[PDB]
Amino acid sequence: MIHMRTGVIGVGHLGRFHAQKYAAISQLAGVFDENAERAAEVAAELRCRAFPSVDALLAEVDAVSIVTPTSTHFAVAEVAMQAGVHCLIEKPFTLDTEEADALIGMAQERHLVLAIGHIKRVHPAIQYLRQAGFGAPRYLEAERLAPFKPRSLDIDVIMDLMIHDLDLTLLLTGAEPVDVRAVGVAAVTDKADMATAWMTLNNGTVANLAASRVVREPARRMRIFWQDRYASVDFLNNTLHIYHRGAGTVPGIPGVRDEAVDLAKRDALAAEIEDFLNAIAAHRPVFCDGVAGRRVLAAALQVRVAVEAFLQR
Numbered sequence: 001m002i003h004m005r006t007g008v009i010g011v012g013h014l015g016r017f018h019a020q021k022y023a024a025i026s027q028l029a030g031v032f033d034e035n036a037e038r039a040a041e042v043a044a045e046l047r048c049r050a051f052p053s054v055d056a057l058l059a060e061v062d063a064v065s066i067v068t069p070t071s072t073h074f075a076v077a078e079v080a081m082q083a084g085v086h087c088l089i090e091k092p093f094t095l096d097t098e099e100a101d102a103l104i105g106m107a108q109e110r111h112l113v114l115a116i117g118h119i120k121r122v123h124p125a126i127q128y129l130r131q132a133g134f135g136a137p138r139y140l141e142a143e144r145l146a147p148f149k150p151r152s153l154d155i156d157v158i159m160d161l162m163i164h165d166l167d168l169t170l171l172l173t174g175a176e177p178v179d180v181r182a183v184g185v186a187a188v189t190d191k192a193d194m195a196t197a198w199m200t201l202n203n204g205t206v207a208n209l210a211a212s213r214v215v216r217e218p219a220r221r222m223r224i225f226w227q228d229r230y231a232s233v234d235f236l237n238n239t240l241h242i243y244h245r246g247a248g249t250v251p252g253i254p255g256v257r258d259e260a261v262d263l264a265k266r267d268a269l270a271a272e273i274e275d276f277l278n279a280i281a282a283h284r285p286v287f288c289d290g291v292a293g294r295r296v297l298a299a300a301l302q303v304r305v306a307v308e309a310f311l312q313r
């Protein structure tokens with residue numbers, strides 16, 4: 001438990017979970033939401049305050065999570081940083097890279113920790129693969145497929161789904177995109193319901209990333225290819241398999257050993273929030289800062305522009 005005054009700005013569906021975590025691991029002053037009823041129920045459930053304004057929240061805390069709609073991230077984070085308050089912003093960072101540039105600048109001027117909520121970085125399989133030190137993968141192939149739900153029309157297939165694997169790509173490789181091509185399929189509306197991007201980075205890595213909001217059953221998978229290894233990750237079922245050239249148990253693939261990696265299930269959002277607060281308190285680097293958030297944001301905008309161009313021809 002960290003000794004820190006914390007708050008959440010925006011306590012809808014996911015903001016409430018942020019608030020639960022902060023209440024468990026820090027001194028949660030309370031919450032603010034534009035819908036007063038909703039803040040009031042969140043505060044009643046967590047036994048914190050429901051604040052009458054964002055400013056009165058900010059007066060009583062050192063750090064906040066910002067879990068408001070993406071188009072509001074800039075204005076809210078601007079107010080929060082003007083008050084010298086550190087910020088964990090839910091992904092995606094902002095709507096465009098100029099807002100992200102401005103908040104990075106204001107954060108540096110204020111000597112504030114700026115973290116973006118890119119939860120997939122703290123997934124147990126990704127942590128294990130980073131600690132294995134395999135180097136930059138040469139090829140990544142990923143699928144993020146979500147069933148159509150009443151709210152799916154507000155799911156941006158690139159900015160809300162694919163951005164996870166775009167970010168993972170940029171992190172595991174440490175490289176920058178040189179070429180982005182993409183296709184999209186729009187069934188319900190003019191907006192893509194599924195998209196697939198083919199990204200070439202400046203170290204020669206290729207990422208082949210699919211996302212959909214209209215599938216039957218969920219699917220969250222990533223296959224990763226190095227020169228001497230193959231990693232298969234089921235994010236949903238929390239499983240990891242690593243193949244190397246070996247001693248013969250794998251059917252249909254000769255001369256390879258499949259190592260089933262024993263992954264522990266942990267609370268990802270609790271992990272991300274503890275990391276944010278430790279970064280403030282120890283001055284150590286946070287799991288995903290503003291710079292990385294903007295990197296993936298620029299890539300995702302490239303993908304989306306390509307997708308909308310495909311769909312419009």
Ligand SMILES: O=S(=O)(O)C[C@H](O)[C@@H](O)CS(=O)(=O)O
Nearest residue numbers: 141221223231232233234241
């Ligand atoms: O089980 S795995 O996760 O190892 C791969 C899948 O079986 C297959 O759908 C895709 S692949 O094997 O051709 O890359």
